[PDB]
From TrEMBL, chain G:
Localization of this protein: Cytoplasm; Nucleus
Shown part of the complete sequence: 296 to 369 of 442
Record-given protein name: 26S proteasome regulatory subunit 6A
Subunit structure, as described in the record: Component of the 19S proteasome regulatory particle complex. The 26S proteasome consists of a 20S core particle (CP) and two 19S regulatory subunits (RP). The regulatory particle is made of a lid composed of 9 subunits, a base containing 6 ATPases including PSMC3 and few additional components. Interacts with PAAF1.
Summary of the function given for this chain in its UniProt record: Component of the 26S proteasome, a multiprotein complex involved in the ATP-dependent degradation of ubiquitinated proteins. This complex plays a key role in the maintenance of protein homeostasis by removing misfolded or damaged proteins, which could impair cellular functions, and by removing proteins whose functions are no longer required. Therefore, the proteasome participates in numerous cellular processes, including cell cycle progression, apoptosis, or DNA damage repair.
Family assignment from sequence similarity: Belongs to the AAA ATPase family.
Top-rank lineage group of the source organism: Eukaryota
Signal peptide boundaries: none
TrEMBL record, chain H:
Compartment list: Cytoplasm; Nucleus
Name of this protein: 26S proteasome regulatory subunit 10B
Top-level taxon in the UniProt lineage: Eukaryota
Shown residues in whole-protein numbering: 253 to 303 of 403
Signal peptide residue numbers: none
Family: Belongs to the AAA ATPase family.
Length: 234, 246, 233, 238, 246, 219, 74, 51, 245, 249
């Protein structure tokens, strides 16, 4: 129980002028599970792969798809442990905000808060950045919202985004399949299709989790409801 | 350079590799295998079971206070697999937090709250370059109030997840795939049935073939509010039935 | 690589052996205890007439009846002197009389070696100071000259020299300077020894002398006084 | 080598060379001898200085009204440790108000010295201390290492070329126990001189004595009564 | 803090590395000259690198620590202004000046500020994981006396008073030309002192009135930083005087 | 001041309250909800001094939120009791809040009454605000100490209506909050006992009693 | 020292000799006729393929001389 | 059992020719029958990725 | 490996692909260097037998002793480096003293052992400090918890033993325990046995010379950790010598 | 262990530069065009919007135009990551100053508070410096309209017209060629800024998805901070685009 910590330079700039650690963290998120977020403008839908590659996992309460608060949720891609502390931390900020305002934290506000954390991990030494990309959803103040925060501590605004394996193809399939001024139903259908275009093959309702977000709140649907959806998609 | 990052620092301290995930973190999962302990845990609807070696190596080592089944607290108990030094250290930290929770928060502790709480801590240890990603893995049993009997396992990496069936140890991959065949050809879980499945997996995989003094079984039962070791009497009654099984 | 904190097979620390060398780099200072008083002499060694010679100081006051000449890195010493000023008046609040040469010197020396380069508090040294101080004054007990080292070994002297000429000068003092040599003769002894390390001859703009004598407080010698010792060397 | 980069650097044998290398620093220090009877604890010390035209500043330090120390090694570090001990001895006198035990005080030095040797990026303290102290259980003369281990000796010599002096300590080991104050000091001088070459025989000027005991508190004789112990000369006994 | 990694460690050469690295960075460039008058002290820097599109009014390279203490700074590289590095020394010195004036009713002297620069450099040396600033400052000011003073400091923290000194791009070369220009009349007439600063700056590289900025202090009155328009008129009159003597 | 009760019945938990929230015995506001809805699972009745009660519920709600999400167990009333006892101690026993925490665990529905004391108090059926004994006294009287859910719901509403009648402080609508652990039915008008008289007739005036010399919009 | 995975080079004159040395210790040819007295400064440097308990049977540590041992050496 | 190599000595070069030959002989267009070929290793990690 | 400037022996946060921690292991080789300390659990107490290293010719009793009293009824025998052992004595004694104050009953060995082990284990995890270079036994008698023997190594493990050895001879010494029935046996007879094991195991190159120190904590001392009488030591010494011949 | 890993990038070099600030200096140059020009009735900023897709939410006002206060606004050249933490901190500082003084904060006062922090990272601590260089635009009572630039150690310079980012030398020289020290009005000032952005940027006709331009204009004695919308921007593009067309002829 005797330590001061170490802070050392592998977290300072290289001669190239780009940060050595950020590139590696982006590599961790690319290796992850694919995750799509689509803002319907009738609600925000987020889809991820439920699986972890053995389906001896109970997951009826353990999910990749977790509500932070009454109508804001996070879906992730990338590293599982790092995400676990970020889920827990994000909630803690949400409730702090909840005490003062009475409204749950906006997606726009929440990301900056989370971003500081990602930043500490890069900039100080003896740590390393989180390797998790976040899709942050909400419906609040009369408009549904989708934000991206990548692992470096950047936040980017998109209305349809894809992640993980074949993040590039997902963004192009979204551009093509989904058009603007379509409804919520259409949005839900397109996400499962982006996941088909982003790791292909066999799907069960224990290989996918789909969660829908409204002002009613974020909920991850039960295994049965997800099953009906599967049959629709090619 | 090949054969580890020796001109680099990436296995020397915690920082991301040129390949994404750390050497050191992957390496921690290799420390488990050193312990010599393999644990198989099977989730039932009567009890959630742990079967681990009682096995002693001499007359000089206790067996009246040496066990790898630990009573974190009454409702929830756990098994540690891997390095013994790290094993005790997490158990005590877990015990103190369990009392403190019960005292302040007042909520009864399910499987999730201990599992998730430790997991977040073991993320901090992985994240600091002073501390090392853990040498042990914790497999918890305990009764969830909504679900029923639950078996969770948390990673030395800092991830928690639920399991109907799990295995940790020297033969982590061999036992989990073996137990996978048992799930697939499903068993309607009675008391005797979850205990039977766990011992047959471990007996085949190690290829020692255990007897009742060599294993100690841990149950947390739906009528027992406390954690209890079944000991030899119940194990032998199942043990014979195992030979008659297949 | 190896650290600097380590002990060598010689049986000494690296950082400290370097610090003694730092003392050797600077300008020479002579502090002579005579029983008529304590004189401190230092070389200015100016290279430009645009400088104002009063403000080149290397004699600074620890106390109002103790003067100190310092050698090696001029800057590195100054901090030790800043802490010394606070202690002498502090000593007046508590004891209700002024600090002695012995009391002040042992207290600064504790700080001299404390060094832990990594995993040591930022309110404590990473490296020792390369300064040798010569604390020369006459106090309640009488004329005393104490010498302080960067190794934090304090010892009482009657004649001590430190700076580039430190070994050479110290031997040469033991010879001329004795306790059968008066105070004015101590000033003449220091001036001769001073010249080898100096780049030029001795002058009243190339020495600074201050003597603290019994029954008197610290006096900084004026241009006339410097010039009377210059006439006969 | 690289068994001594930091004081956390182990050798395959299982030894930190820096802590050992810190002992070699004690050998650079000045010779000090520690002896005890049944009523006194006696410390005989070598003082050296750069000016011998001036009185030599003592190498015997004040810790308590019945505890005194003699240092061999690093001068700043010995004084540095001395202050922790001094604070505790004087504090022990306020609170407990016994004449504090040498065994008790010495273990507390063992906790503090262990801190840097345990800690990375630091140096051990390379100073060996001989403490004379008198409590109500009689004298004790203890040796404390650059490590943290202690010996309770009847006689010990740590310092420069201490082997030569031990040859004397081994020879009159029985005698120490019976002695009165005078006898302890004459033996320590005869021991002390041996460390140094054959043709050098001590002067009172460079000898400081710290005398502790039953009939006395703490008195340091720098030349005060040093002359009668020195008398009765014996020159380098082989 | 957690950072205690070495940046300065002592040399057997009897120096501190940073201090010497700083000292050469004032050899190689950023001409700052100061002369001390008999009513007024003037300090001048050459370069703010006014490329005829930059602002001249709000840019400060001469900063008022107090209303009777001012400093002009220099140390240069490829990163040419080390204004940032200066800006720390400037802010801590500013509070300290004001602070000294609250406690001690004498107006703060340059001699106090110079000891304060010697201790800031040093303090940064002793603290673990910390490094001395590269700055050298020409501390100008007024005492209790009301006597004009010009003092100069080095990156180690050693100070001397000087009637006239030049540093940058050959400290000794600019000063030895300037040495002829320092006469009894020049120091007496205030107007001649303003010209003396400008006249030195011109030796290294000639012309520019925008590149040259100088600040003037008269008595204990506040710092006045002169317009570049005032400088241009002054360089034109200096150039003709050179032809007159010669 | 306020009249709040919550009940343990043979169904789930029925909370009854008068509307009015008063700063002392005088109404700060004659609108909103005294019984507050928090997260989906937790409902809390409020009584005694207004200032102390609203804020206590709110602060505990964050703590309880953290504990619910991580643990993934439904909230326990004993659990809720301990959190209020610890928080209120932290503050140092300042102000008066008689608080009614009521949540459904996986077992039965559990109701507790925590007064400001910082006690570990287990009721049987409780009513709060006013005087703790005075409100509690009613439960022993009308309840036979268990009857069917529907009969019990009319019973609480009737007993709470009597306290509204007897004590004029409570005013406006009587709200009933039927609370499960995901279903929060907030029935504004269980009984309206009293309401005002219409403010149809003005007390307005033309400018000739006070006039205006400005109408401008600054920039 | 065989910990090889060396995706780039790694010599391997040395690899062949490390494997051949095992072969001669193995009882394809005797090992009751050849005994090996091996001296190496550390076993940390060495790999377990070599050490075993049927390549090198006894493990005799040599600590630095004791106090009595140095008097005997003199 | 070889590796990618290609910055090595002359010793890393000879191993590859032999390692190439084994591949074709097993499965290439040539293959065994009743006769069986047994390999012995210490590490399966020292082996060529193709092997 | 052992000669390096980054990680391995500098750190202990490091892992090899095997999983090893080399620094924690180097600490283990350090306990091995000095002579053996044995502590034997009886159903009635603990008896220790310790080699007390004679490092000079001007010895007095208790000099470089390895017998400590953690609590009134706990004794602690250390083996390996004595420098690290002194710091470990302060930490163990402190955890026990506060325990007695608060709980007001005799510290359970199972609890004390868990706390010191955690402390050793906090250092082995860390690369910021090295871990202790000794291994120790805590042994005790109480009637509130029974006779207990625990052992803590440089790694940070606490497990109970009924007869243990730490130090150079421990693999040989331990074997002699399997021979003896010691779980049920008076503390008076077991003193005779710890003394004879030590005399035979000692040789002139594990350490030059030793002084025999045996200690009681059992039915004889009435649950007090004390050093054995002059009489007890000598008869147990005699039996050691007679068995040695 | 720990020092060895520490690359000693916190060390001074003999020449008198910090290695880190110099490597940060390159990070600014990779990144897009941020230019600020002074005008005589207002002041304007033009920054490169790098978020072009056909599916964009626009949850923020802009991802490079940041209104730091209710009297200051800024644009970015560097890395978005550093920009986000930094932008928040810039807001607490601007806003506290507004509380005490109650007058718009000088552009010079705003760069200096941050500078201490930048410097702290570089010199010691082994902490990266921020990867963005900020162009702050404002009006403060004392000087009138001003533009301030900050660098990766907080080195400051007051500029009438300056540009950092991609093709920084090209943009600043060009702008130097037409305009030298405040020769134009607010109307003309937007048309130059978009023109410079046009040449520097790969798309040589631009749209409002490619550029985002922000104005800070002093109206009725009070500073108005407005991010101009896409509609206003197209008008400014057609004015420069047309001016370019005449040039050729």
């Amino acid at each position: 129980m005797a330590e001061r910590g170490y802070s050392f330079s592998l977290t300072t700039f290289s001669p190239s002028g780009k940060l050595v650690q950020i590139e590696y963290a982006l590599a961790a998120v690319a290796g992850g599970a694919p995750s799509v977020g689509i803002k319907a403008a009738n609600g925000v839908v987020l889809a991820t792969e439920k699986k972890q590659k053995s389906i001896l996992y109970d997951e009826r309460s353990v999910h990749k798809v977790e509500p932070i608060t009454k109508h804001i949720g996070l879906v992730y891609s990338g590293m599982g442990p790092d995400y676990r502390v970020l889920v827990h931390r994000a909630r803690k900020l949400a409730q702090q905000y909840y005490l003062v305002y009475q409204e749950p934290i906006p997606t726009a506000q929440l990301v900056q808060r989370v971003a500081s954390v990602m930043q500490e991990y890069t900039q100080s030494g003896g740590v390393r950045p989180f390797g998790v990309s976040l899709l942050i959803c909400g419906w609040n103040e009369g408009r549904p919202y989708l934000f991206q925060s990548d692992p470096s501590g950047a936040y980017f605004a998109w209305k349809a985004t894809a992640m993980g394996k074949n993040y590039v193809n997902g963004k192009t399939f979204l551009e093509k399949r989904y058009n603007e001024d379509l409804e919520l139903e259409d949005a839900i259908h397109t996400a499962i299709l982006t996941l088909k275009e982003s790791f292909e093959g066999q799907m069960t309702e224990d290989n996918i989790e789909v969660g829908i977000c409204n002002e009613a709140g974020f909920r991850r649907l039960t295994p049965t409801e997800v099953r009906d959806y599967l049959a629709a998609i090619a | 350079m090949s054969r580890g990052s020796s001109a680099g620092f990436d296995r020397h301290i915690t920082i991301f590799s040129p390949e994404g995930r750390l050497y050191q973190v992957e390496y921690a999962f290799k420390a488990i295998n050193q312990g010599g302990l393999t644990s198989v845990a099977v989730r039932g609807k009567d009890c959630a079971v742990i079967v681990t070696q009682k096995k002693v190596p001499d007359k000089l080592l206790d067996s009246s206070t040496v066990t790898h089944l630990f009573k974190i607290t009454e409702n929830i108990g756990c098994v540690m697999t891997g390095m013994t030094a790290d094993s005790r250290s997490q158990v005590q930290r877990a015990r103190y937090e369990a009392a403190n929770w019960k005292y302040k928060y007042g909520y009864e502790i399910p499987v999730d709250m201990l599992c998730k709480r430790i997991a977040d801590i073991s993320q901090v240890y992985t994240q600091n370059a002073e501390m090392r990603p853990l040498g042990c893995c914790m497999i918890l049993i305990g009764i969830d109030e909504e679900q029923g009997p639950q078996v969770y396992k948390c990673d030395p990496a800092g991830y928690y997840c639920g399991f109907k069936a799990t295995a940790a140890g020297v033969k982590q991959t061999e036992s989990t795939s073996f137990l996978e065949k048992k799930v697939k050809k499903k068993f309607d879980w009675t008391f005797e049935q979850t205990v039977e499945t766990a011992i047959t997996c471990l007996s085949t995989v190690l290829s020692i073939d255990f007897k009742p003094s060599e294993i100690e079984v841990g149950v947390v039962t739906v009528e027992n509010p406390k954690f209890r070791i079944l000991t030899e009497a119940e194990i032998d009654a199942h043990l014979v039935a195992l030979a008659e099984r297949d | 690589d190896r650290g600097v904190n380590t002990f060598s097979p010689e049986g000494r620390l690296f950082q400290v052996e370097y610090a003694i060398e730092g003392h050797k780099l600077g300008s020479t200072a002579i502090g002579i205890q005579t029983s008529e008083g304590v004189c401190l002499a230092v070389e200015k060694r100016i290279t430009s007439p645009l400088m104002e010679p009063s403000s080149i100081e290397k004699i600074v006051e620890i106390d109002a009846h103790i003067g100190c000449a310092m050698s090696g890195l001029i800057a590195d010493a100054k901090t030790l002197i800043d802490k010394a000023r606070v202690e002498t008046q502090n000593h007046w609040f508590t004891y209700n009389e002024t600090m002695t040469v012995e009391s002040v010197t042992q207290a600064v020396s504790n700080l001299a070696l404390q060094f832990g380069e990594e995993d040591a508090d930022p309110g404590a040294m990473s490296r020792p100071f390369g300064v040798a101080l010569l604390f020369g004054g006459v106090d309640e007990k009488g004329p005393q000259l104490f010498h302080m080292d960067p190794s934090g070994t304090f010892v009482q002297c009657d004649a001590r020299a430190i700076g580039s000429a430190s070994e050479g000068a110290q031997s040469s003092l033991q010879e001329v300077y004795h306790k059968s040599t008066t105070l004015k003769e101590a000033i003449k002894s220091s001036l001769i020894i001073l010249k080898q390390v100096m780049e030029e001859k001795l002058n009243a703009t190339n020495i600074e002398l201050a003597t603290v004598q019994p029954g008197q407080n610290f006096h900084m010698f004026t241009k006339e006084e410097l010039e009377e010792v210059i006439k006969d060397i | 080598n690289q068994y001594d980069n930091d004081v956390t650097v182990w050798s395959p044998q299982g030894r930190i060379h820096q802590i050992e290398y810190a002992m070699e620093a004690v050998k650079q220090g000045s010779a000090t001898v520690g002896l005890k009877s049944k009523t006194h604890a006696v410390l005989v010390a070598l003082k050296r200085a750069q000016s011998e035209l001036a009185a030599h500043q003592k190498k015997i330090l004040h810790v308590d009204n019945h505890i005194g120390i003699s240092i061999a090694g690093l001068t700043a570090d010995a004084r540095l440790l001395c202050n922790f001990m001094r604070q505790e001895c004087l504090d022990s006198r306020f609170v407990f108000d016994r004449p504090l035990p040498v065994s008790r005080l010495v273990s507390l030095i063992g906790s503090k010295t262990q801190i840097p040797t345990q800690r990375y990026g630091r140096r051990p303290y390379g100073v060996g201390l001989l403490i004379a102290g008198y409590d109500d259980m009689g004298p004790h003369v203890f040796q404390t290492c650059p490590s943290a281990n202690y010996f309770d000796c009847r006689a010990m010599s740590i310092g420069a070329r201490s082997q030569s002096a031990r040859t004397y300590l081994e020879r009159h080991m029985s005698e120490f126990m019976q002695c009165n104050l005078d006898e302890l000091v004459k033996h320590g001088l005869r021991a002390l001189r041996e460390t140094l070459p054959a043709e050098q025989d001590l002067t009172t000027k460079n000898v400081s004595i710290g005398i502790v005991g039953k009939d006395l508190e703490f008195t340091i004789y720098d030349d005060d009564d040093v002359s009668p112990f020195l008398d009765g000369l014996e020159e380098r006994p082989q | 803090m957690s950072y205690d990694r070495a940046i300065t460690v002592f040399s057997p050469d009897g120096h501190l590395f940073q201090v010497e690295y700083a000292q050469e960075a004032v050899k190689k460039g950023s001409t700052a000259v100061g002369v001390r008058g008999r009513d007024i002290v003037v300090l001048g820097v050459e370069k703010k690198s006014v490329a005829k599109l930059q602002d001249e009014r709000t840019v400060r390279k001469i900063c008022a620590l107090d209303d009777n203490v001012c400093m002009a700074f220099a140390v240069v590289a490829s990163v040419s202004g080390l204004t940032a590095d200066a800006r720390i020394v400037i802010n801590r010195a500013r509070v300290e000046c004001q602070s000294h004036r609250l406690t001690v009713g004498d107006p703060v002297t340059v001699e106090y500020i110079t000891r304060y620069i010697a201790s800031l450099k040093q303090r940064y040396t002793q603290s673990n994981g910390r490094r001395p600033f590269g700055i050298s400052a020409l501390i100008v000011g007024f005492d209790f006396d009301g006597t004009p003073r010009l003092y100069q400091t080095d990156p180690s923290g050693t100070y001397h008073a000087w009637k006239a000194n030049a540093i940058g791009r050959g400290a000794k070369s600019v000063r030895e030309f300037l040495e002829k220009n320092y006469t009894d009349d020049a120091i007496e007439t205030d107007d001649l002192t303003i010209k003396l600063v400008i006249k030195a700056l011109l030796e290294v590289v000639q012309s520019g009135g925008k590149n040259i900025e100088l600040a003037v202090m008269r008595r204990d009155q506040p710092l006045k930083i002169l317009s570049p328009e005032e400088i241009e008129k002054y360089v034109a009159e200096i150039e003709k005087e050179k032809e007159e003597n010669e | 001041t306020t009249i709040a009760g919550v009940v343990y019945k043979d169904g789930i938990v029925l909370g009854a309250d008068t509307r009015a929230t008063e700063g002392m015995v005088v109404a700060d506001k004659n609108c909103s909800k005294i019984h507050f809805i928090s997260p989906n699972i937790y409902c809390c009745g409020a009584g005694t001094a207004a200032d102390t009660d609203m804020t206590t519920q709110l602060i505990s709600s964050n703590l309880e939120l953290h504990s619910l999400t991580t643990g993934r167990l439904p909230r326990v009333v004993t659990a809720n009791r301990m959190l209020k006892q610890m928080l209120f101690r932290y503050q140092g026993y300042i102000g008066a809040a008689l608080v009614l925490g009521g949540v459904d665990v996986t077992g039965p529905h559990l109701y507790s009454i925590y007064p400001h004391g910082s006690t570990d108090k287990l009721p049987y059926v409780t009513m709060g605000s006013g005087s703790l004994a005075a409100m509690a006294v009613f439960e022993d009287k009308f309840r036979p100490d268990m009857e069917e859910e529907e009969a019990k719901k009319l019973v609480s509403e009737a007993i709470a209506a009597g306290i509204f009648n007897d004590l004029g402080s409570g005013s406006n609508i009587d709200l009933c909050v039927i609370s499960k652990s995901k279903l929060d039915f907030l029935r504004p008008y269980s009984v309206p006992n009293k309401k005002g008289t219409r403010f149809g007739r003005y007390r307005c005036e033309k400018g000739t009693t006070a006039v205006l010399t400005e109408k401008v919009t600054p920039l | 020292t065989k910990r090889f995975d060396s995706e780039k080079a790694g010599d391997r004159e040395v690899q062949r000799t490390m494997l051949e040395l095992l072969n001669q210790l193995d009882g394809f040819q005797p090992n009751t006729q050849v005994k090996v007295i091996a001296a190496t400064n550390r076993v940390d440097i060495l790999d377990p393929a070599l050490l075993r308990s049927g390549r090198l049977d006894r493990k005799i540590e040599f600590p630095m001389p004791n106090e009595e041992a140095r008097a005997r050496i003199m | 059992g070889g590796r990618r190599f290609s910055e090595g000595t002359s010793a890393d070069r000879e191993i590859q020719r032999t390692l190439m030959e084994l591949l074709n002989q097993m499965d290439g267009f040539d293959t065994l029958h009743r006769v069986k070929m047994i390999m012995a290793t210490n590490r399966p990690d020292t082996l060529d990725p193709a092997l | 490996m052992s000669s390096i400037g980054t990680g391995y022996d500098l750190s202990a946060s490091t892992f090899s692909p095997d999983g090893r921690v080399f620094q924690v292991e180097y600490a283990m080789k350090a306990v091995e260097n000095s002579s053996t300390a044995i502590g034997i659990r009886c159903k009635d107490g603990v008896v220790f037998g310790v080699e007390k290293l004679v490092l000079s010719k001007l010895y007095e009793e208790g000099s470089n002793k390895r017998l400590f009293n953690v609590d009134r009824h706990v004794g602690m025998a250390v083996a390996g480096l004595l420098a690290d052992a002194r710091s470990l004595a302060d930490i163990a004694r402190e955890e026990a003293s506060n325990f007695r104050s608060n709980f007001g009953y005799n510290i359970p060995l199972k609890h004390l052992a868990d706390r010191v082990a955690m402390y050793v284990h906090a250092y082995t995890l860390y690369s910021a400090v090295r871990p202790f270079g000794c291994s120790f036994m805590l042994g005790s008698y109480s009637v509130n918890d029974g006779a207990q023997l625990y052992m803590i190594d440089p790694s940070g493990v606490s497990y109970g033993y009924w007869g243990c050895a730490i130090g150079k001879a421990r693999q040989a010494a331990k074997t002699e325990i399997e021979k003896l029935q010691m779980k049920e046996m008076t503390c008076r007879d077991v003193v005779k046995e710890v003394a004879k094991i030590i005399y035979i195991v000692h040789d002139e190159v594990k350490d030059k010379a030793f002084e025999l120190e045996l200690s009681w904590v059992g039915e004889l001392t009435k649950g007090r950790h004390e050093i054995v009488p002059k009489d007890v030591r000598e008869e147990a010494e005699k039996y050691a010598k007679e068995s040695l011949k | 262990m720990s020092r060895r890993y520490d690359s000693r990038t916190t060390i001074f070099s003999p020449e008198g530069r910090l290695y880190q600030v110099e490597y940060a200096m390159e990070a600014i140059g990779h990144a897009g065009t941020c230019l600020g020009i002074l005008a005589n009735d207002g002041v304007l900023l033009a920054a490169e919007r790098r978020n072009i897709h056909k599916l964009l939410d626009e949850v923020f006002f802009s991802e490079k135009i940041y209104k730091l206060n209710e009297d200051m606004a800024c644009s970015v050249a560097g890395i978005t990551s550093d920009a986000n933490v930094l932008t928040n901190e810039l807001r607490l500082i601007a806003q506290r100053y507004l509380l005490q003084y109650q007058e718009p904060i000088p552009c010079e006062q705003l760069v200096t508070a941050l500078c201490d922090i930048k410097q702290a990272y570089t010199q010691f601590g082994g902490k990266r410096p921020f990867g963005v260089s900020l162009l702050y635009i404002g009006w403060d009572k004392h000087y009138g309209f001003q533009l301030y630039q900050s660098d990766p150690s907080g080195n400051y310079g007051g500029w009438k017209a300056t540009c950092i980012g991609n093709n920084s030398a090209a943009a600043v020289s060009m702008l130097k060629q037409d305009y030298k020290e405040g020769e134009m009005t607010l109307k003309s000032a937007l048309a130059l800024a978009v023109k410079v952005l046009n040449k520097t940027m790969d798309v040589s006709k631009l749209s409002a998805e490619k550029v985002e331009i922000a104005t800070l204009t002093r109206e009725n004695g009070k500073t108005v901070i407005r991010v101009l919308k896409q509609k206003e921007v197209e008008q400014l593009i057609k004015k420069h685009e047309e001016e370019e067309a005449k040039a050729e002829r």
